[PDB]
Design a binder for this molecule. Sequence first.
Ligand code: LSC
Ligand SMILES: *[C@@H]1O[C@H](CO[C@@H]2O[C@@H](C)[C@@H](O)[C@@H](O)[C@@H]2O)[C@@H](O)[C@H](O)[C@H]1NC(C)=O
Ligand code: D12
Ligand code: HEX
Lengths: 263, 95, 201, 244
Amino acid sequence: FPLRCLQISSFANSSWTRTDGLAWLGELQTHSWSQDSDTVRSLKPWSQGTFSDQQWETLQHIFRVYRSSFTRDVKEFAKMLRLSYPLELQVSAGCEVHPGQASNNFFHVAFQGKDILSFQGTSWEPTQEAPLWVNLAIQVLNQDKWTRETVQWLLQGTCPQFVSGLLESGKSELKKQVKPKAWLSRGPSPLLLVCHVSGFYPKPVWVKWMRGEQEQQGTQPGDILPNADETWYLRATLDVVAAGLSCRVKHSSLEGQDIVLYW
Amino acid sequence: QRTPKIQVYSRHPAENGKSNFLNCYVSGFHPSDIEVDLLKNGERIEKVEHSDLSFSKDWSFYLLYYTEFTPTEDEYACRVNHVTLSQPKIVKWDR
Amino acid sequence: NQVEQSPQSLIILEGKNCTLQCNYTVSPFSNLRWYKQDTGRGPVSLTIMTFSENTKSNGRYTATLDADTKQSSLHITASQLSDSASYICVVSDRGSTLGRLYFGRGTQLTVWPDIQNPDPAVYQLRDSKSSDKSVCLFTDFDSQTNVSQKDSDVYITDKCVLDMRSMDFKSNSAVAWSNKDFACANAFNNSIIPEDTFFPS
Amino acid sequence: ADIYQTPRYLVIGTGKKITLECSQTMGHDKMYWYQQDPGMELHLIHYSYGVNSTEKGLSSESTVSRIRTEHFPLTLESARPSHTSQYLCASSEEGALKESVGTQYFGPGTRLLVLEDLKNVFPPEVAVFEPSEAEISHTQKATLVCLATGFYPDHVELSWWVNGKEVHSGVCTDPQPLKEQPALNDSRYALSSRLRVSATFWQNPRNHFRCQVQFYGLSENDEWTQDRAKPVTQIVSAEAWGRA
Ligand SMILES: CCCCCCCC/C=C/CCCCCCCC(=O)OC[C@@H](O)COP(=O)(O)OCC[N+](C)(C)C
Ligand SMILES: *[C@@H]1O[C@H](CO[C@@H]2O[C@@H](C)[C@@H](O)[C@@H](O)[C@@H]2O)[C@@H](O)[C@H](O)[C@H]1NC(C)=O
Ligand SMILES: CCCCCCCCCCCC
Ligand SMILES: CCCCCC
């Protein structure tokens, strides 16, 4: 159950820019930050976790200054490095608390859809993907001691705390379960068969076609899609000539008892 | 760069006359600026909600549009235009 | 404005002390500078302060920084005339070349000389060429006294201090002239003159 | 210090093309151009991270070209009264590596005056005034007075010279020129200056005193259609000899 803080910054021209963020806790979006609004918006009641109104207010401030700060830094590097608008900067950082051992953390950032640099240890570092003129930007970002310090305190000393506060305050929901409805269908022609499953949670699931107690590969699993309920949907399929066969579904809602269908 | 993977579906199987939800999942696209119009017989629906924009581990963006739509033996579709899309693209709904 | 200074301006006798104030709301904070800008000259940098430092001493100047309250002050010990100038507070938001600068309106500091043995007098100086085209010189008066310049009839210069380093002697002076029947007793009717002032006849 | 500007004084008509030269002997990468209106604070107009780096700071009609490290010339395609102000050039040691962002270093500055016409420019007239015999006998010291009048604009540099050597001890010059006819925006100025010397020195008839004013005005190239002598940049002096 990792906490993923995602940031999306798009610079149209040197004139116009919007920057929105969100916080995923495992597979559940918890927070969302809008460019327009000043305050971060909690999506779940257990969002603020164990933190106080105070502890939270501090943190919110930090982001407020950051968002602006960050935005200008880019627009400046643009001038400094001769980059060309439009630009698309993304950022994905956070941590995952282990009950047994210490928690790990990560701070990645990508430019124009490509890993560019990350924060590891006590500084910044360029990805193997980023060109040799990025060393510049890195040299600059690293000159800044105070930020680096703060960044660390967040990964090793803040995120983790806020995560254990969530795990607790969210314990009950993360443990919820939802049995999915299942059914079969004909579908488009190669005659391919379809096995649909919809309305479940958590995300992990197991769906496969099989003609006997011993299943078979060649079952093409679709992609796991969402519903406004945070529930998921899934289509597993197979191509054949050979009529009789069945579909099975293994999940944690249908505890102990999987689901089977025929034809 | 990337180009959007459109996938139109529904929350529950469609029993005509019974109200349902119509989802449209756009993914794998880049950059992030995107236009998404849900359609009805080629007519934009005014009332629709959408998830917050988000990106995968591979930095591609994904998003979810949806509305409450009572089906009828009415054509539905999902129009999308992107930086990588010469002309708007439409993806019809299979029942 | 993100940077406010105080006081707006102040006058002090040489040898005395003073402390200039500066309060910023700039965020984030990287470092604090103090510039001294003499009349019609370039701003000169006195001290640079990062948040990790609360003191930076240069000559008779000592600058303290309190990042908590977001204010800085500049102490000046044993003021001397050369200290008369505009003192600017400068704040930087970034600890890198990526940083914007915010300048204060500045504080105007004037240092008057301490006249221990004042000897007020009004003299008349004749021209070295033409005739007689004279001019009046009010000199050797306490800094307590004040003489102002904006009239177009008769002209009075601003009080000004000149220092003779050789003799360790400093004196005030003000010049008045007129193109019109002009008498020295008049030109300087007009500002507070120490009731004891020599005169020409 | 190690940073340069020229010219320190410039008065030019509207529409004329101007460029303010700026050069640093230090290897500073970052440079700034400031505009400072009298009494106002420093306004940031242009800045550069290094060669080929030119960025606008307030939006001015001015342009900054950096084809070289040591040069940072500021140019105005078409002059205009609104541009009237003092222009300062600065460079910081900022960048690279240190336990602090390099401090800033500023130049002497350049005060330009833009006018619709140049018909109102006047060179100064100068006069020296010998010490009062009364002053001498009383204070045992003697003050010469220099008066420079009827000059416009107020771009001027007064200086005393005793026996050929410029002096600073004993000299006191007016903080700022004072308008002769303060009721009109375009008015000529007057400027005073004093020099005090021991009565002994002044009483030596072979001691020579000269106060000179550097007046910055038009150039030989400028157009002049009026009757009087063209008010070109020039020197104007006045002298006095000691005497018993
Ligand atoms: C094309 C290349 C793109 C690269 C993009 C860079 C990668 C992302 C890096 C971003 C770093 C920039 C962040 C800006 C600095 C933010 C620092 C900060 O997080 O401020 C906290 C704020 O809350 C301060 O509050 P304050 O009230 O002003 O007080 C601060 C006083 N001190 C402690 C700072 C001295
Ligand atoms: C600068 O750009 C701004 C946004 O332009 C965008 O164009 C496409 C890419 C979409 O992002 C669309 O939403 C935006 O309009 C403009 O708002 C602004 O006017 C532009 N400036 C000028 C004068 O061109
Ligand atoms: C603009 C960036 C916003 C990213 C979303 C963060 C939401 C709060 C998470 C606090 C945990 C550190
Ligand atoms: C994505 C959130 C980063 C916050 C850094 C202060």
